[model samples]
Target: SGAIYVGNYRVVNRHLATHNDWANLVWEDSSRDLLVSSTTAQGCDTIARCDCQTGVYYCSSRRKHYPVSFSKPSLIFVEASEYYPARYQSHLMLAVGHSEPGDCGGILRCQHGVVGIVSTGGNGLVGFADVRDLLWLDE
Candidate 1:
């Protein structure tokens, strides 16, 4: 069970599901083969396989799998072979935060927010880009 932590932004194995659909939606119908084929066509090497239903992949000569959450746009998996030397796993994390003043009789107020992660492990690390990055591509 591995964990990702950057400052206060930390991700634990058990909490992965809670954020799956927060920023991008993991396509239920997508499969490891389809993703591999797509990336290969894009000139990437096939280093490992990923099974969406199982939430696992071949990592560093072993079958490594973990619970993952999808967001709004969707996720596309890819092989890690070409980028394995660089430790690229084709995974991404997406999060959104919102804070609004709470209505109250007093001058005091409250705020709230939400965060999420999405990936196939490329863009910066995850192979595929999230919705936000995809949107940027359009611009």
Candidate 2:
């Protein structure tokens, strides 16, 4: 559980779920019964919410519905690896230049939608796994 300061409100929220995919985090805003997809709202009138099973899949092991999608390659923040599995090459995107280590986990937004999350930086570049390719079976 945690809180976010949004538009004059210290909105309380909770870490509802997590997956081994793209470092995405699903949080629940108890104040409004809404699910948040990132850490901050960033002044957008509508924050990403999971009101339905639109892009969700049921993971039997956890017995819960998790967000899943190929959402396409959208520009995030300013459009934008670590060496992920070879299969991820299809969508893994990178941004040229450098970012602070604290930049990891920061949400990437494109046309006002959350598309990717920062993963790592080095070698005159930064890398991130597209949200579209975060989930994969180890096998």
Candidate 3:
């Protein structure tokens, strides 16, 4: 099937899931929360900002989404976009690193609450952003 465009978003083929550049954004029809993920390391800068707090976060991949310590702030750069051009403007972003790859959109939970949405990963290191701040953006 061809891509479907609604204003700035496109309908993607889920059969392509597991592909390195694949992610999904889903919201409950009756609920107030939304879940999102990144398609690739190249487009993560444009995902919505998560509004959760920082400190001692856990990201489960193998044995557990064990806690990974992020000692300093990290910067992530995105260079491409599949739906909107404004995303290119978000080339610079704040992100934290994790230990696993391929879990690009995994949830980053902390003692306080959900604080991050995995954004970039591959090769080995992973990076993510706050989970509650995603919608205030043009998304």
Clashes of 1: 27
Query: Model 3: per-residue lDDT, tens digit, 1-139?
Result: 1222222432222322233323345321101112223432233223324433344433456534545543232333433334223232111123344444434445555554445445444444555444334343335
lDDT of each: 0.23, 0.34, 0.37
List model 2 lDDT by residue over 18-119, tens digit each: 342114334332222223344333433222322211232222223343344323443333222222222223233455535444444444444324444444
Global Cα lDDT for candidate 2: 0.34
For lDDT, candidate 1 versus 2, the one ahead is: 2
CA deviation > 4 Å runs, candidate 2: 1-90, 132-139
Ranking by lDDT: 3, 2, 1
Top candidate, metric TM-score? 3
lDDT of 1 by residue, 1-139 (tens): 2222222222222213234322332222122111100111122111112222112222221233233333333333344443123232223332221111110000100111012122233232322122122111111
* Rank list by TM-score: 3, 2, 1
Q: Which scores better on lDDT, 1 or 3?
A: 3
Tell me how many clashing residue pairs each candidate has.
27, 2, 11
- Model 1 spans with C-alpha error above 4 angstroms: 1-11, 14-71, 80-112, 118-120, 123-139
